[PDB]
Amino acid sequence: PLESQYQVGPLLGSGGFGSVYSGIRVSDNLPVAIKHVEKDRISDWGELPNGTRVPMEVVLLKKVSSGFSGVIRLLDWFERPDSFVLILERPEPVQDLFDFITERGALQEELARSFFWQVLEAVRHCHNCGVLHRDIKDENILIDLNRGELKLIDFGSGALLKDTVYTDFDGTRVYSPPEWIRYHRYHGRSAAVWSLGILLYDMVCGDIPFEHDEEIIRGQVFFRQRVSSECQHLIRWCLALRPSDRPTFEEIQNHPWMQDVLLPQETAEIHLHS
Ligand SMILES: O=c1[nH]c(-c2ccc(NCC3CCNCC3)cc2Cl)nc2c1oc1ccc(Br)cc12
Numbered sequence: 001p002l003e004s005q006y007q008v009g010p011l012l013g014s015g016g017f018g019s020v021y022s023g024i025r026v027s028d029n030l031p032v033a034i035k036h037v038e039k040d041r042i043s044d045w046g047e048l049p050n051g052t053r054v055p056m057e058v059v060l061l062k063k064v065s066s067g068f069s070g071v072i073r074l075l076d077w078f079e080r081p082d083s084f085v086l087i088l089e090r091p092e093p094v095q096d097l098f099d100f101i102t103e104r105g106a107l108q109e110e111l112a113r114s115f116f117w118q119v120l121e122a123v124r125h126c127h128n129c130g131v132l133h134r135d136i137k138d139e140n141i142l143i144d145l146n147r148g149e150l151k152l153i154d155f156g157s158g159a160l161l162k163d164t165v166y167t168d169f170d171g172t173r174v175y176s177p178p179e180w181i182r183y184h185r186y187h188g189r190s191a192a193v194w195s196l197g198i199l200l201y202d203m204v205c206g207d208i209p210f211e212h213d214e215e216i217i218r219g220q221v222f223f224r225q226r227v228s229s230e231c232q233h234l235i236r237w238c239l240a241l242r243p244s245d246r247p248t249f250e251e252i253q254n255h256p257w258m259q260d261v262l263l264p265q266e267t268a269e270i271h272l273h274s
Contacts (some may be wrong), residue, residue, distance in 0.1 A: 002078070006087065008034060016041075017156050022090065025075075031090040032075060037156070038083050042169070044159070055084055060155040064129045070122030072142070072153045088153075094143045097203075106206035106225045109257075114267040115141075116200055117258060118150040123192060124249055125154070132161040132188045135171040135193040138202055148268030161188055174198070174208055174216075178241055181213050190243035193252070196253035197238025204231055209239075230257035 005081040009022035018037040025032055036053060046059040061074035097115070101107065107115070119141060126133055133140075142151045157171045165185045170243040171178060177194035180186050201209045201234045204227050210216045219241045223232060234257045252258065268274050 003034075003085075006032060012271075015155055024089075025087075025089075029246060030075075030199045031092045033088040033090045033205045035086045035088060037086070038082050040082070042084075044162075044168075055156075056158065057156045058084070058086065059087075060131045060158045060160075061086070063131050064126055064155075068125055069149055070118060070125055070152060071177075072151050085128060091142065091144035091147075091149075091151065095143050095145060097141045097143060097150075100143060101138055101202065101206060106243070109204060109228060109231060110262065111267065111271045112200065112203040112231075113258065114118055114148070114264065114271075115150055116203065117253070117261045118264065119152070119196065119199065120249060122150065122152045123196070126158075127161055127189070127192075127249075130161050131155070131158055132192065133158045134169070134191070135175070136192065137172055137175050138199065143272075145272050146268065146274060148264040148272055150264075159188075163187075166191070171195075173213075174210060176216070177243070178217050178219060179243055181216050187243060189248070190246050193238050193246040193249075194243075196252070197235050197246075200231075200235050200238065204235075228257070230255075233257070 005022045005026060007026050012020045012022055012033065014020070018035055020033050020035045023032045023034045024030065037057065042055045044056040045053055046056045047053055048059065058077055065074050075087040075089060077084060077086045116201050119136070123133065123136065133152065133155060135154060140152060140154045142153055144151065165187055167185055169180055175195040175198045177191050198208055201221065205223060205225050209221055209269060219239055221236055221239055234255050237247050262270070
């Protein structure tokens with residue numbers, strides 16, 4: 001029971017998500033992350049197999065936990081008077097994609113591809129486990145710099161995956177698809193693909209392509225940097241205005257630009273200098 005199992009360290013960051021801290025498991029010194037979430041700010045609750053009230057975040061994390069290292073692991077969690085606490089694996093050394101992109105600009109395509117493929121594989125996993133993330137974006141992807149592996153994080157906005165329409169969204173606006181902006185309705189897989197389209201553009205251009213509802217609704221994509229035509233094509237496809245025109249994951253991964261991906265480890269050697 002309790003903290004004193006773990007050993008709190010520097011705050012890593014905070015926001016509408018809550019607050020996350022570096023920490024060590026005192027027993028075996030495992031690097032972990034301690035994420036605190038206030039009950040008043042939680043909005044989407046669910047319940048466990050064993051039948052108890054919890055943040056959806058926790059349900060979703062348990063549903064997707066496993067060997068698969070494309071998604072952060074939930075190690076344990078605790079309930080408090082006015083908060084919850086989640087203990088998550090921490091890789092060390094680690095940097096999130098956003099910070100990596102600020103630091104290094106528009107990524108080389110070889111690297112964007114390794115990365116993007118890894119994201120794709122992580123998301124497929126979530127959908128295989130019945131979970132839909134709803135906030136795919138550079139900040140919510142961690143890079144394990146030794147192993148050249150990407151981990152997805154922050155399921156605070158996600159939802160059980162379903163085949164019917166979604167009328168709620170509390171993700172990140174600029175990553176949301178046109179059909180949310182206009183109609184306040186979307187379907188899971190097609191909304192995901194759109195945000196992945198924003199994600200790839202961000203990677204290859206050093207920034208997100210739309211900053212305003214107007215540009216989202218319009219959906220014309222302008223490339224501010226040299227980007228190969230296959231890449232441009234893949235991105236424009238993911239950003240088709242009509243959802244059903246977007247590619248499935250299978251089509252994304254069978255797309256020409258996605259051929260001959262580097263393994264994560266050879267990515268690290270070549271591109272993380274390690
Ligand atoms: O849920 C999370 N959110 C966040 C998170 C997401 C977005 C942000 N904010 C935006 C970024 C923060 C850093 N880059 C510039 C601005 C901050 C955090 Cl702390 N981090 C983690 C989360 O779970 C983690 C597990 C292990 C580790 Br290491 C980190 C996390």
